[PDB]
Design a protein around this ligand. Structure first.
Ligand SMILES: *[C@@H]1O[C@H](CO)[C@@H](O[C@@H]2O[C@H](CO)[C@@H](O)[C@H](O)[C@H]2NC(C)=O)[C@H](O)[C@H]1NC(C)=O
Ligand SMILES: *[C@@H]1O[C@H](CO)[C@@H](O[C@@H]2O[C@H](CO)[C@@H](O)[C@H](O)[C@H]2NC(C)=O)[C@H](O)[C@H]1NC(C)=O
Ligand SMILES: *[C@@H]1O[C@H](CO)[C@@H](O[C@@H]2O[C@H](CO)[C@@H](O)[C@H](O)[C@H]2NC(C)=O)[C@H](O)[C@H]1NC(C)=O
Ligand SMILES: *[C@@H]1O[C@H](CO)[C@@H](O[C@@H]2O[C@H](CO)[C@@H](O)[C@H](O)[C@H]2NC(C)=O)[C@H](O)[C@H]1NC(C)=O
Ligand SMILES: *[C@@H]1O[C@H](CO)[C@@H](O[C@@H]2O[C@H](CO)[C@@H](O)[C@H](O)[C@H]2NC(C)=O)[C@H](O)[C@H]1NC(C)=O
Ligand SMILES: *[C@@H]1O[C@H](CO)[C@@H](O[C@@H]2O[C@H](CO)[C@@H](O)[C@H](O)[C@H]2NC(C)=O)[C@H](O)[C@H]1NC(C)=O
Lengths: 583, 583, 583
């Protein structure tokens, strides 16, 4: 009787199913959450008189219908068009070469080009109908507003590392962007994968290749699967023979089956409309004093700085520099960002060994952390590489039968070294990784592991006749703070010929290691690594109540009242009586 | 008149049958339980106006329809795609090489490749319709909330080994994950199994193999079973002759029969939608102070640590290291995880014998446990391998005719040894296993059993002329704490050439034994070993009442009131009056 | 107006006919009883809107449809797949090699392979629809709860041997398992039995055998019985000639007749759904203090130990060790469990004779049991083999015409011996068996019987010229406590070349005897031996009232009130006043 169903009973019209305002992940092109609030109170319609739209939504009739007769050749996977999220992946940002490179449509296309030495062609029937946009005066959703107040409460009780944790659960549930405009329509695409040596002789008749690819697309749709085709004349005999893959997907409308008139596909697009393009803005753009009137001024500029840090950390991880030229050697298959590390010679290095010590600062009673946090050399110059503090909580139970239990914490800082007539290297495996020497979390035969950063193992053998089959050279560790001195004989990268691999993200700082195997390189493409990148804190910090919030340079002060009402602006006679009881 | 039927009478629409929130087992890809609460109070619909969804559920219209013209070749069973649970099996975890390897679809495919020396190809018509997700603000179910309170009660009455037992009945009923997003659709798959020598000559024309496999798939669906096929031209005469198996399964929609137009299959998918992909999060992720507001803070971080231990124990069991290379010798067929134990030479070892002693600490009256817990040598250096305590309860009946009965317990610790001109080895069989020398729970001819770990038998014969037909060599025992010293002449694995086998899980610690038979290896694939891995306790521990719960480092205290009301936060004037009567 | 018919009048929908919660016998794959309570109060439906389900039941839509084009060859009957109860027969148990080996489908398949030297192939169209499961919070049925209280009453009046008898009537009525999940669907199977020498020459073209077997299956279903087949080309001329049997069974849906389109069979599966797979848990798993809140704690752990003993006794009986290799001699046809007793030489033994004595302890008046309980030698070293006490009740009638009758009992312990120039052996026959020398309960010509264990006869003749046609050698008696000393010249088995046979189960202990005939071996397969394995007791034990039940180690006590109300927990001030009047 309220909301949609009140409008839907009076009008008896469908609701438009393609709406802006939701969140958007831009590494994996998926949408998530609902940032903006959508209400159906005025019973608005599209001025066709055909759909029902919310109140803060205006549509623009496009009624456009493209129809292409030539496929387009896109040879490299580095410059990637998306066909559904092209306007939002190509924004001007620092990470424009990482957007969209963890999606379903991209990971298939990179696989089919590398494993077959192939080039791809697509041809398309696109058919845009509306453009749906949001008004500039707009209200946040009920569930998204409550999660911004919780980050503000943790920042005003001096609880960092809990506000940081709640900011990374905001990226996980709402993405990195907000879509401000969509495009309702229905596409129909065919992608083929031709052998790359079929293009190189037909450099003059490249226009004859793509003319037959768009010719075969309209035989596939118009003719039923039995061969009544009109394309097999001259070069639709090697086009069929140099191709390595073919698929046809429809995105809106009715489902596609071979042999359906393009007349009949285009008459089922009504009431089956999806978003075939979209654009938007980053997520921290919508955190400003205009959208949040209840909080003070400089407090929402501190929440918006926390969310901006969590989004940029999510792009800093899931970024793999390496070599990208396919015909060159040292080709890294997991790399999504070029480095210039191609055509670079190598030089062998000898590492003496790794060792690890612990400190055991506070928790001397009832918990002994400083036995597994220590690792000594099985057999140069060591480097420190990390200063990491490990905290653990335990439980007493004082009984008196009534009892009580108290929770302490136990700190133990550890230090992990490596030496710059030497131990061999057999790979690494962690609690989120495997060793690709064995395709399993095990060192090979003869090798023995030893812990280095409290979560991963270091496959090492001291021999020179039996473990020489799995021995791969080593290039050096570095971190987010200290680069290795092996490059520039500093910078944070591998030397030439080597490739880096992530290992052991530890509280907003990952360390890396350089190898030269060729076996760590290949395999399947890695998935995206989702936030939170930190385990939850133990609530060890005490809450410090803040009552008055001020800034010095325009003489504005916000006084929180009793009862936790709200933040009102401080009149200059009440803050005069509130600072004496404070100071 | 409430719930679904109120919405279903007014709207007269079906309910969407593919919903998130339920549990999920990730070794065997099955779903179980319902972790999240789903309510039908606002009578929401999918904005098509076609289905009825719960209140805390938002759908995303995809309306996508893939159609592939080439089969894909996947040669090895080690890297396994699932086609229905691929997004959730490939999560970043320690046990990513064990997920999905106890399911129906996997165990068939490993069988058909090993027993035939075959490779598999699949081709598919996939047709995704919606994406159904859960809101981040969400309530636990009524039945799952009550089983988390019962683990908290056992932890606050100092009843360990009962809270551990109730945590393993939570994994049995709700799985190891919670699905947070599903994909409603309907697939149609054909899998074939070609002979592996048919690929190796057609290395150049591998693209001609897969083009005919996708050609035969569309003759099978479009043509009725009588041969009107258009594929038998050149190489659809050995493709039919090198194949070893073939099946066609449909997953959603109407049932498949040979000869049905793809037009007609795709028009029955409405109202018959199933989950063709899903993703989720682990089960202990959803146990936090946000979801459980009634319990104290550090108490739900102790329940969530108990459930995390029970899940990781379920992956530690059902893990079989061994050799995996098929053409190599020493191939272990039961192994699902590689070891590097391939291409390793063997060395014979002589074991003197096993013997077992008992202690009989407490139950000296009315129960004699220390006669069957003892086993002496029928005929080096012994090792201890285990220190296990065996508890049994009995019953007095004091009569006075009125009577009364009291229940005691009887402890008897046992020790089981083995010696590092020697007894022969004929296999083992237990209360959950058989001896594969006989395919039965019996020692062979000439062999006599003797107990070793209070539940299994050790087939042994002292002769050298008659029991030499069933004698297999022996490689050594080890446990979850002590590895054998026979490897590295320590580590917890077999020496080279040998294979390990589980025997006698005893209270969260299994022991293993290394053999070299070739007969223990083969057979059928083992099923998953389900929790609980411990028999129920005898309630021997006394309940210790806890009233006040505190942590030291933010000065928060929770005071349980009378009547067992609930846990309220302790004001600093009531805990001042509650600690004096306590201490 | 209540229950099903209230929901069935409002909704006008059928009820789903495949439900969990019932019992299950696992030797004979049949279902029996109803352990869990099923109520129809909320009028729930399957979210199709198609069936009506109970309240504590959730279904999972599968909508899957397999279709196989190759038969599968299963050569041996030892590893047996069931096609309807495969998930529940393959549980991890001690008796996994006995599950399902007394069913209708197994006993036919073992018969057709032994009597014809044949191998079996099956091909199948499987079509799974739903998966129906039970919630973890669940209530026992009304009739099953009342039979668990009756076992508890006999255990608390010190009436053993009546609680043991009532526990074996619980296995008879409710089976050994409870099904927790079923699979609604409809299969369609063809089984053939080919001659075993037809496989051995087609080792390379085994893939051509199974391709024609799945080809003949789809000619049988699609074509009417007149020969319009498309299979008779090359090897569908000896496949028809090497086969020894053929049947086609349907399990759900409409009945099968030759010539029906697979289109038409798959459209009758709606409203005709049966269980095509199931899984479950043992019966004593569901006897715990959670399911039975009224009884005390350690009392339901004593009922659950009694039922576990009665189930394991039912698997200990119906287990026949013997030789299993078919081409080897000494092949035992009744044996369902291997022994290693194949390829073993024999040695003749001479037994002097059997004799039997009685004691007549108590019933000296009015009943003379010690004349038929005695048997003396008709003509070494004797062994005792059994100490069994025989009790009989009689009736006085004291008259005074008014009268009264009193019932006593008469005990008479008997002892049965056999001697380790000798009596010949002609077989045995009992009150539940026959002599297979005559296929009747009679000794052969010249032989005379003599009683040994108060119920069976021992066919014996002292001659050496006339009873030499029916004389078979003898291998020795043993029991559940004492093995024979003839093996290991101890163990409880036959010597080599001999086979054991059951005789005279007497109060939870059977004795066995070893022969070497070849005529006792063959015949028909024995049926399952159902509980109770003990005649009912004579109520000779006096009832001892128990009022207070306690355990020592958590200081909990349960005080039964007056009137036989119930068992309430004892407060520490009432048991203080209840133990003084007790002790
Ligand atoms: C507010 O929080 C910050 C962040 O932890 C505190 O700063 C640290 O406090 C510890 C405790 O003495 C010091 O050892 C560190 O050196 C401090 N670090 C920095 C960068 O200042 C701060 O003390 C807290 N303030 C209050 C009043 O609790
Ligand atoms: C892949 O493409 C090449 C073209 O670069 C094909 O090679 C030509 O095939 C035609 C077919 O008759 C010949 O007449 C030409 O002589 C070939 N060479 C050149 C340089 O044009 C090749 O055949 C294609 N692959 C397949 C499998 O057909
Ligand atoms: C709480 O439970 C723990 C777990 O059993 C008890 O700890 C053990 O108690 C026994 C009894 O004296 C000792 O023999 C063990 O050495 C203890 N083990 C450990 C690791 O502490 C503990 O005593 C219980 N506390 C109370 C008050 O009952
Ligand atoms: C399995 O595949 C092999 C190909 O590796 C087939 O062998 C070829 O069969 C064709 C059939 O006429 C012959 O012309 C070739 O000479 C064979 N050899 C090669 C190297 O191509 C084999 O026939 C297939 N199996 C069956 C049963 O047909
Ligand atoms: C409770 O029942 C048991 C089981 O029969 C009784 O135990 C036997 O009692 C007879 C009668 O004196 C003795 O001859 C046996 O030696 C007893 N056997 C055992 C194993 O104890 C027991 O006496 C009964 N108790 C009462 C109070 O009636
Ligand atoms: C049972 O199978 C055997 C195959 O092992 C058949 O023997 C063959 O029959 C064909 C029929 O013409 C002959 O051409 C072959 O020479 C036979 N022998 C071999 C070794 O292949 C046998 O005929 C089958 N039984 C029946 C009754 O047909």
């Amino acid at each position: 009787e309220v909301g949609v169903q009140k409008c839907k009973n009076a009008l008896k019209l469908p609701v438009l199913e393609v709406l802006p305002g939701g969140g958007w992940d831009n590494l994996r092109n998926v949408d998530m959450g609902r940032v903006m609030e959508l209400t159906y109170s005025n019973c608005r319609t599209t001025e066709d008189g055909q759909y029902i739209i919310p109140d803060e939504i205006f549509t623009i009739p496009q009624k456009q219908s493209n129809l292409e007769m030539n496929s387009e050749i896109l040879e490299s996977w580095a410059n990637y068009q998306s066909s559904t999220s092209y306007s939002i992946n190509t924004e001007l940002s620092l990470f424009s070469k990482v957007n969209g490179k963890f999606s379903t449509e991209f990971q298939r296309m990179k696989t089919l080009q590398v494993k077959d030495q192939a080039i791809t062609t697509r041809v398309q029937v696109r058919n845009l109908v509306y453009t749906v946009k949001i008004n500039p005066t707009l209200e946040l959703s009920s569930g998204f507003r409550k999660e911004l107040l919780d980050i503000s409460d943790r920042l005003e009780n001096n609880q960092t590392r809990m506000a940081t944790y709640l900011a990374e659960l905001l990226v996980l549930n709402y993405g990195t962007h907000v879509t401000t405009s969509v495009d309702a329509g229905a596409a129909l695409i065919q992608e083929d994968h031709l052998r790359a040596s079929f293009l190189q002789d037909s450099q003059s008749s490249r226009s004859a290749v793509t003319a037959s690819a768009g010719l075969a697309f309209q035989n596939t749709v118009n003719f039923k699967f039995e061969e009544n085709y009109t394309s097999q004349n001259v070069l639709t005999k090697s086009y069929l023979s140099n191709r390595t893959n073919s698929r046809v997907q429809s995105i809106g409308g009715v489902p596609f089956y071979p042999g359906i008139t393009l007349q009949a596909w285009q008459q089922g697009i009504t009431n089956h409309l999806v978003a075939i393009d979209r654009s938007g803005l980053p997520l921290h753009f919508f955190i400003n004093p205009n959208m949040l009137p209840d909080l003070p001024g400089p407090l929402v500029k501190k929440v918006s700085k926390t969310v901006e840090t969590a989004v940029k950390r999510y792009y800093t991880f899931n970024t793999y520099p390496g070599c990208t030229d396919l015909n060159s050697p040292n080709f890294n298959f997991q790399a999504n960002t070029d480095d210039g590390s191609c055509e670079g010679k190598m030089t062998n290095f000898s590492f003496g060994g790794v060792y690890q010590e612990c400190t055991q600062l506070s928790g001397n009673r009832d918990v002994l952390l400083c036995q597994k946090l220590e690792q000594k050399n099985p057999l140069y110059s060591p480097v420190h590489l990390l200063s990491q503090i490990h905290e653990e909580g335990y439980n007493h139970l004082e009984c008196h039968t009534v009892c009580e239990d108290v929770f302490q914490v136990a700190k133990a800082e550890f230090r992990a070294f490596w030496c710059v007539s030497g131990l061999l290297f057999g790979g690494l495996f962690s609690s989120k990784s495997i060793n690709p020497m064995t395709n399993a979390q095990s060192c090979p035969a003869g090798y023995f592991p030893l812990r280095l950063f409290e979560n991963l193992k270091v496959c090492v053998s001291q021999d020179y006749e039996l473990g020489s089959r799995f021995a791969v050279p080593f290039g050096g560790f570095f971190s987010c703070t200290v680069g290795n001195p092996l490059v520039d004989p500093s910078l944070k990268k591998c030397p030439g010929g080597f490739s880096q691999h992530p290992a052991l993200i530890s509280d907003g700082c990952q360390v890396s290691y350089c190898v030269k195997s060729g076996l760590f390189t290949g395999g399947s493409l890695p998935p995206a690594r989702l936030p939170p990148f930190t385990r939850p804190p133990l609530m060890s910090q005490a809450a410090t109540n803040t009552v008055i919030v001020t800034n010095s340079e325009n003489a504005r002060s916000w006084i929180k009242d009793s009862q936790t009402h709200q933040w009102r602006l401080g009149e200059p006679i009440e803050l005069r009586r509130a600072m004496n009881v404070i100071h």
